Amino acid sequence: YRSLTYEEVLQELVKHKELLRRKDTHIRELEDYIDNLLVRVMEETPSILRVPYEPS
Amino acid sequence: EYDYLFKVVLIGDSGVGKSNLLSRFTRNEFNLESKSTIGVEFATRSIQVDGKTIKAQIWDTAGQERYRAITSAYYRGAVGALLVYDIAKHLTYENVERWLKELRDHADSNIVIMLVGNKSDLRHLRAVPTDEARAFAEKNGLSFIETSALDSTNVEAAFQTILTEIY
């Protein structure tokens, strides 16, 4: 933590911004997958999305 | 069985209390630590209104994003919609016209819409005057009600009204 130089916390800030960008990208990929899957579930077997879930 | 099966959708900004309105109506349950809804789901409740038994099929999804791949299927066959805002957050009310446009663009012309001001329990934090929202609803031909999923006020009345107004 406080053992790092100014230049070293700057590089770490850079590193964590890169990373957080990648995590946001991944979240969007997961969200997209979910929505695309759900379109098919909703059109084909919407009962799957019921709460509580009852299998057919 | 039932005399009628009505699909109703919940819409409105993230955080306004859609999922807790659903849980309160269908199970008389409320969760203070509820998180943004992932995916899409529905829950059912049968009720006696006007001497008829209506199976209400209530759909729910997060309101983080107005339009998604699931939006058309979400609105498809829906005959009722609860358009919900948070009385304690004026921004959620400002966005009501945007949600109304999403309806007008993707739902049936004859969908019955009920404007719902939720979190009425937060009296001390009110940011949307009742008269303001009621006037908007009137102008736009929408029924209007204030609810609290937390303390249960008007939750059944909101759903009862819209289900009634679909027949």
Ligand SMILES: Nc1nc2c(ncn2[C@@H]2O[C@H](COP(=O)(O)OP(=O)(O)NP(=O)(O)O)[C@@H](O)[C@H]2O)c(=O)[nH]1
């Ligand atoms: N005080 C108060 N808090 C409420 C009320 N209804 C819901 N909340 C709280 O508001 C937060 C969001 O509720 P939630 O139902 O998850 O909102 P949502 O509209 O489903 N969110 P999302 O669209 O992102 O799924 C939660 O902490 C919940 O407990 C209410 O009537 N009063």
Ligand SMILES: [Mg+2]
């Ligand atoms: Mg929700």
